[PDB]
């Protein structure tokens, strides 16, 4: 809170943090895409997709 | 000295060669694999082999003669070779085989033995000859459900179902005087041949015209024969080309000469004036490639064939090649066109001025059957020298730019991308 209750300090820090987290999410999405890339996507049959890929 | 052409019922065509020490006399029919159907496919190939059968060859050999036969898409030939003096002995054999004999060569033992022979022959080709097998499949997919799609050797399925009757049916329908031309090449005079032919009589199915059918059509498509157990990837790719006697026949052949042929293992081949070579040698994209401009009566194929052990970079091989083709429409240079002219002339000269009478026999017969005469190198060379950069660009903008392609491949082709990725490369982005 930065005080005795939700007040000025709380709102100002929340806005600063609201600006920041989206960039952390972006970084986490890059990490998400990296994990995805090494094994590739799965498919609806649940079996190997290695025998028939398309760009 | 200008190739004579006389007709008295039977069209006789000769090409005298004073430097030749042998002579070739034979008959060329204007019917080939393109005149068969999916079910009798291979009948012509079977005929070629019974004609080259031991019994028939032994008879010819006793007379000091050599037999040759070639099954093509639009035509079919049967030639006898001998010394310039034994030229009349060739005619007797030829006359015998296509007028006297019939039940002799089509006997149960000869036909079955020959059938078994071509069966193992075709099986070996389909099993081991990868570059040619792929080129045959290019024709098959490009002209599917059309005459030009049938392989010249026939298919195993139709071959094993063929009986003596099928051979006879084809012979009665195609081996006709109206669909033939008797050729004479090497060291022989026209009069000597025409009088020796005019010596005999008879007709054997006179006035009879061959069967007709539906015309060849090109279809953008592909056939993929993946085989991961093979050491390379063999690919053939092409667009609809030019038929024989097309106004762009030479412009197309010259365009193909621009990109030419290549053998990575030949030192001089790596030094050719081909811009594509700068792109493909850095990471050695292929072992070899050869561009072509195949021409037939109803249609043609323009493109290339390639073989490669670089299975992870096939996409670059195809991409760079097609990007070079793009250039024929927008930026091909004058020197590329001039280099192509010189090399095309050399190619044609080597093809037509070969020291082989049988080759001349096949070429002469095939051409006279299609246009009634044979074009001379003198005229061909003149047409070639007249080709300009604008002619190449006009032809490319019509046949290459944003046009459908036919693809065939076998071996380790996992790296060959989907049809659309390859098809998109037939053009470039423009403002
Ligand atoms: C901003 C958030 C996210 C982004 C941008 C994102 C993006 C992607 C993309 C582009 C793919 C590949 C295509 C697809 O399958 O949809 C993917 C796959 C996947 N994502 Fe996400 N994702 C996000 C959140 C999540 C969440 C919240 C979970 C799970 C708790 C998740 C689990 C997965 C999994 C398991 C796959 C693989 C699906 C498969 O191939 O079977 N993702 N994601
Ligand atoms: C972030 C939002 C912005 C969106 C803006 C939208 C972008 C629109 C781009 C539109 C056209 O871009 C244009 O695409 C066509 C293909 O469709 C290209 O065409 C190219 O490929 C086509 C198709 O094989 C050929 O026929 C053509 O001769 C060739 O030039 C053209 O050269 C390019 O200039």
Curated annotation (Swiss-Prot), chain A:
A ubiquinone binds at residue 37. Heme b b562 binds at residue 18. It is found in: Mitochondrion inner membrane. The chain crosses the membrane at residues 8-39. Heme b b566 binds at residue 32. Residues 40-55 are mitochondrial matrix. Component of the ubiquinol-cytochrome c oxidoreductase (cytochrome b-c1 complex, complex III, CIII), a multisubunit enzyme composed of 10 subunits. The complex is composed of 3 respiratory subunits cytochrome b (COB), cytochrome c1 (CYT1) and Rieske protein (RIP1), 2 core protein subunits COR1 and QCR2, and 5 low-molecular weight protein subunits QCR6, QCR7, QCR8, QCR9 and QCR10. Belongs to the cytochrome b family. Heme 1 (or BL or b562) is low-potential and absorbs at about 562 nm, and heme 2 (or BH or b566) is high-potential and absorbs at about 566 nm. This is Cytochrome b. The lineage of its organism: Eukaryota, Fungi, Dikarya, Ascomycota, Saccharomycotina. The gene is COB. The chain holds residues 166 to 220 of 385 of the full protein.
UniProtKB/Swiss-Prot annotation, chain B:
Component of the ubiquinol-cytochrome c oxidoreductase (cytochrome b-c1 complex, complex III, CIII), a multisubunit enzyme composed of 10 subunits. The complex is composed of 3 respiratory subunits cytochrome b (COB), cytochrome c1 (CYT1) and Rieske protein (RIP1), 2 core protein subunits COR1 and QCR2, and 5 low-molecular weight protein subunits QCR6, QCR7, QCR8, QCR9 and QCR10. One of its GO terms (molecular function) is metalloendopeptidase activity. It is a peripheral membrane protein. PANTHER family: CYTOCHROME B-C1 COMPLEX SUBUNIT 1, MITOCHONDRIAL (PTHR11851:SF126), METALLOPROTEASE (PTHR11851). The lineage of its organism: Eukaryota, Fungi, Dikarya, Ascomycota, Saccharomycotina. This is Cytochrome b-c1 complex subunit 1, mitochondrial. Its main location: mitochondrion. Keywords: Electron transport, Membrane, Mitochondrion, Mitochondrion inner membrane, Respiratory chain, Transit peptide, Transport. Present with 19300 molecules/cell in log phase SD medium. InterPro entries: Metalloenz_LuxS/M16 (IPR011249), MPP/UQCRC_Complex (IPR050361), Pept_M16_N (IPR011765), Peptidase_M16_C (IPR007863). The keyword Glycoprotein does not apply. It holds the Pfam family Peptidase_M16.
């Amino acid at each position: 809170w930065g005080g005795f209750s939700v007040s000025n300090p709380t709102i100002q820090r929340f806005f600063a943090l609201h600006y920041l987290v989206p960039f952390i999410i972006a970084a986490m999405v890059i990490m998400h895409l990296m994990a995805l890339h090494i094994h590739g996507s799965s498919n609806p049959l649940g079996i190997t997709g290695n025998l028939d890929r398309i760009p | 000295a200008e190739v004579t052409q006389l007709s008295n019922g039977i069209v006789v065509a000769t090409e005298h060669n004073p430097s030749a020490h042998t002579a070739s006399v034979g008959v060329v029919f204007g019917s080939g694999a393109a005149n068969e159907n999916p079910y009798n496919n291979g009948v012509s190939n079977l005929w070629k082999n019974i004609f080259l059968s031991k019994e028939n060859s032994a008879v010819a050999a006793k007379e000091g003669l050599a037999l040759s036969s070639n099954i093509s898409r639009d035509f079919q030939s049967y030639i006898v070779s001998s010394l310039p003096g034994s030229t009349d002995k060739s005619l007797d054999f030829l006359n015998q085989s296509f007028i006297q004999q019939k039940a002799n060569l089509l006997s149960s033992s000869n036909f079955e033995a020959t059938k078994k022979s071509v069966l193992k022959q075709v099986q070996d080709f389909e099993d081991n000859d990868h570059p040619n097998r792929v080129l045959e499949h290019l024709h098959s997919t490009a002209f599917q459900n059309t005459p030009l799609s049938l392989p010249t050797r026939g298919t195993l399925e139709s071959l094993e179902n063929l009986v003596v009757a099928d051979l006879e049916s084809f012979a009665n329908n195609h081996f006709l005087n109206s669909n033939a031309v008797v050729v004479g090449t090497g060291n022989i005079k026209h009069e000597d041949l025409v009088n020796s032919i005019e010596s005999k009589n008879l007709s054997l199915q006179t006035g009879t015209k061959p069967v007709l059918k539906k015309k060849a059509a090109f279809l953008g498509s592909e056939v993929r024969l993946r085989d991961d157990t093979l050491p390379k990837a063999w690919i053939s790719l092409a667009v609809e080309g030019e038929p024989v006697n097309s106004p762009n026949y030479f412009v197309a052949k010259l365009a193909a000469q621009i990109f030419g042929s290549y053998n990575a293992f030949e030192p001089a081949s790596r030094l050719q004036g081909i811009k594509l070579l700068d792109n493909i040698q850095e990471y050695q994209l292929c072992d070899n490639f050869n561009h072509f401009s195949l021409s037939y009566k109803d249609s043609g194929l323009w493109g290339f064939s390639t073989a490669t052990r670089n299975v992870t970079m096939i996409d670059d091989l195809i991409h760079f090649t097609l990007k070079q083709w793009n250039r024929l429409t927008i930026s091909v240079t004058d020197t590329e066109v001039e280099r192509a002219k010189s090399l095309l002339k050399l190619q044609l000269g080597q093809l037509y001025e070969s020291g082989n009478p049988v080759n001349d026999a096949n070429l002469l017969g095939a051409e006279v059957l299609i246009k009634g005469s044979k074009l001379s190198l003198g005229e061909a060379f003149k047409k070639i020298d007249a080709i300009t950069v604008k002619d190449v660009k006009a032809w490319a903008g019509k046949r290459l730019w944003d046009q459908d392609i036919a693809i065939a491949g076998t071996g380790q082709i996992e790296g060959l991308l989907d049809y659309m990725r390859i098809r998109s490369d037939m053009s470039m982005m423009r403002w």
